[PDB]
Nucleic acid binder design. Structure first.
Lengths: 50, 48, 50, 476, 50
DNA sequence: GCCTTGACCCTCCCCTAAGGGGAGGGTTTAGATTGTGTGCAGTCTGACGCGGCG
């Protein structure tokens, strides 16, 4: 939601709101076995010990 | 067996001729090295 | 007790949030322009960094 | 101060650049006034050379019969229609014709300044103004190296006092009566000197053409060239004061171009070049700030350099703009359609044919390093998986030598005439093959007999008597 | 080469303008084709097998 | 057989009329903006040499 406040206002009261659903990226999905199919090969993202 | 570009084909046609003798030259990678040191502003040469 | 298992859903969130700051520096750069009345939020979001 | 603590060239540039305080709205006006003061000073100095304004007048005489237009010679007038310029060139013409007939010398030395300050009214274009200044530059530079070789015509004879030699050379300049007192000195040096007094003649008198060619003498236009240098070096150190004070504008613009294939300093150097253009082309009399114009020029220089030198295999600016347009259209379609646009529908969002977009997509990829680690192994690089595809396999080299031997056998199984016709008709054992006429001229025979020879020899070689050694070289 | 030119002017078996770039079974591999998948770029006409 | 000889014949390069289409290059853009920021890496230890430095 892009909120546009006003120019002269004690709060910057809302001049406008533009609310819409923007697509950002595709996130890979863990299959039901704990793998990811990334470029057709099955990959496991290994836990790190840091 | 490896780098000699003119020696590897002579060795091939020598084996096929039944003459197991080599005519070895300079490895090509040594020439690559000489050209990669001369591009460093260092004149490396071969003294006849 | 001093080493910690950081796992798939945490590394993936770290990378997603890196992508989010990449896009939000650009949307801060775009929000301070003067075309501000006629643009929708999906015109200033770049899905490709994220 | 902080000198010696860093080696980073960008830290050094920023540190050295920040020592110049910015300019205010009225600072830029003062600096631009100084620049234009320098250029009108060099104008009013070169107006002392009258062949300059005669050239400009005959340029207007070219504009009389449409050899040019008025916008090519004059950009304005300070104290655009052809209405005023007619009486303007009348003003300069009337001053020139009244200055011509006067020869005197204090009488003829105010008329020239009147000429210069009537000529100041002309806001010349850079073309003509550059032409006149480099013309008078090359004129006095050739006669000036002539004066310098007149001096070093003594160094081949002797080593000499010049502080005694400068008091003599100036002012006579039509004769050797200044050179006649050199033998009145008669120290050993001025012996040798006089024996070259003949080969100095053709030098020392030939500037005597210019002594009447410009109408002036060489010491007057000497001071004119000195004030020329004063004026142009005044304008040059004023443009430098406006370039150095806007070097942060370049950085504020160039930070917006950072990761597009050029280093940061490459971008700000190209922006600096564009800013120097912007300073050269700025008019403060428009009442605009310097930032508004300089931004245009800095943006131009920076994006032009990104188009030129950010890619290994360079694509032109038209293809750079087509790729940029395609990428913008594609990131709009991706936001709308929620997926990557296929080149077919990308061909209807744009208005280009679809194979043009497919080849545009094939262009844009950047070359991979031949040292990229494969799988990030960092013990196996991309470059050691790339084979040399121009070599011929030693089986094919052995086959070619075996085929040469077989051809030698088969061609020795023919007569000398047919073997010669075949060895010249193809390039066998030769550096070239020949036409029927060349082989026939080798044998003082017309071409059709050579064709018949070569045909019958091919017929013989086709037989089962000679062709079982050769047919084995054609893979079935 | 000049000799290959003579060899083909003798027997007349001309050179081919296409080069065999076939996919072959690697040496020593011996098996059964169990699946074939054909992916055609949109715009290329499909052969009988696709 | 060894030659010639005029008649055919092939490929290939360039040409037609009046522009179309594109590639690849130049040029100016005048409200006013005036110091790079990764939400970086930094995380390797031991030996040796050299140079400011007390």
């Amino acid at each position: 939601r892009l909120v546009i406040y006003e120019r002269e206002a004690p709060e910057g009261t809302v001049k406008d709101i533009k609310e819409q659903e923007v697509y950002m990226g595709e996130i890979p999905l863990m299959t039901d076995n704990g793998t990811f199919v990334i470029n057709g090969t099955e990959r496991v993202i290994v836990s790190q010990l840091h | 067996k490896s780098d000699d570009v003119n020696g590897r084909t002579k060795m091939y046609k020598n084996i096929v001729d039944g003459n197991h003798q080599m005519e070895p030259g300079m490895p090509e990678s040594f020439n690559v090295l000489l050209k990669e040191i001369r591009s460093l502003g260092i004149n490396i040469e071969l003294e006849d | 007790g001093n080493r910690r298992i950081r796992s798939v859903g945490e590394m993936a969130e770290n990378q997603f949030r890196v992508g989010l700051v990449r896009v939000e520096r650009a949307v801060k750069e775009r929000l301070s322009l003067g075309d501000l009345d006629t643009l929708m939020p999906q015109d200033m979001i770049n899905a490709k960094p994220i | 101060s902080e000198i010696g603590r860093t080696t980073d060239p960008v830290r050094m540039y920023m540190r050295e650049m920040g020592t110049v305080e910015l300019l205010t709205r009225e600072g830029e006006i003062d600096i631009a006034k100084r620049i234009e003061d320098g250029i009108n000073q060099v104008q009013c100095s070169v107006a002392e050379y009258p062949e300059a304004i005669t050239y400009l007048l005959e340029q207007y005489d070219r504009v009389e019969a449409e050899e040019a237009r008025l916008s090519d010679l004059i950009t304005g007038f300070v104290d655009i229609d052809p209405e005023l310029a007619r009486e303007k060139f009348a003003e300069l013409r009337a001053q020139y014709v009244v200055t011509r007939d006067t020869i005197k010398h204090a009488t003829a030395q105010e008329e020239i300044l009147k000429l210069s300050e009537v000529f100041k009214q002309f806001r010349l274009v850079p073309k003509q103004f550059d032409y006149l200044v480099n013309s008078m530059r090359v004129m006095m530079d050739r006669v000036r190296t002539q004066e310098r070789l007149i001096m070093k015509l003594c160094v081949e004879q002797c080593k000499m006092p010049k502080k005694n030699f400068i008091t003599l050379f100036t002012g006579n300049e039509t004769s050797d009566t200044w050179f006649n007192a050199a033998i009145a000195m008669n120290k050993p040096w001025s012996e040798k000197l006089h024996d070259v007094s003949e080969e100095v003649h053709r030098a020392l008198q030939k500037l005597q053409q210019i002594e009447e060619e410009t109408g002036l003498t060489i010491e007057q236009v000497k001071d004119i060239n000195r004030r020329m240098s004063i004026g142009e070096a005044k304008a040059r150190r004023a443009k430098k004061e406006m370039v150095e004070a806007n070097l942060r504008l370049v950085i504020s613009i160039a930070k917006k171009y950072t990761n597009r294939g050029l280093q940061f300093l490459d971008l700000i150097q190209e922006g600096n070049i564009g800013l120097m253009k912007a300073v050269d082309k700025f008019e403060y009399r428009r009442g605009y700030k310097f930032s508004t114009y300089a931004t245009w020029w800095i943006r131009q220089a920076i994006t032009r350099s990104i188009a030129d030198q950010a890619r290994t295999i360079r694509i032109p600016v038209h293809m750079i703009e087509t790729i940029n347009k395609l990428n913008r259209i594609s990131r709009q379609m991706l936001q709308e359609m929620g997926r990557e646009p296929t080149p077919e529908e990308l061909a209807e969002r744009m208005l280009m044919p679809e194979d043009k977009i497919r080849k545009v997509l094939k262009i844009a990829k950047e070359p991979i390093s031949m040292e990229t680690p494969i799988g990030d192994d960092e013990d196996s690089h991309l470059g050691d998986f790339i084979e040399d595809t121009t070599l011929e396999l030693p089986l094919d080299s052995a086959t070619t030598e075996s085929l040469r031997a077989a051809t030698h056998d088969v061609l020795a199984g023919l007569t000398a005439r047919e073997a010669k016709v075949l060895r010249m008709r193809f390039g066998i054992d030769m550096n070239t093959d020949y036409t029927l006429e060349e082989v026939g001229k080798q044998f003082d025979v017309t071409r059709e007999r050579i064709r018949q020879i070569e045909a019958k020899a091919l017929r013989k070689l086709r037989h089962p008597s000679r062709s079982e050694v050769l047919r084995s070289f054609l893979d079935d | 080469t000049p000799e290959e030119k003579l060899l083909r002017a003798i027997f007349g078996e001309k050179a081919s303008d296409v080069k065999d770039s076939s996919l072959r079974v690697p040496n020593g591999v011996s098996g059964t084709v169990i699946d074939v998948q054909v992916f055609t770029r949109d715009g290329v006409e499909k052969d009988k097998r696709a």
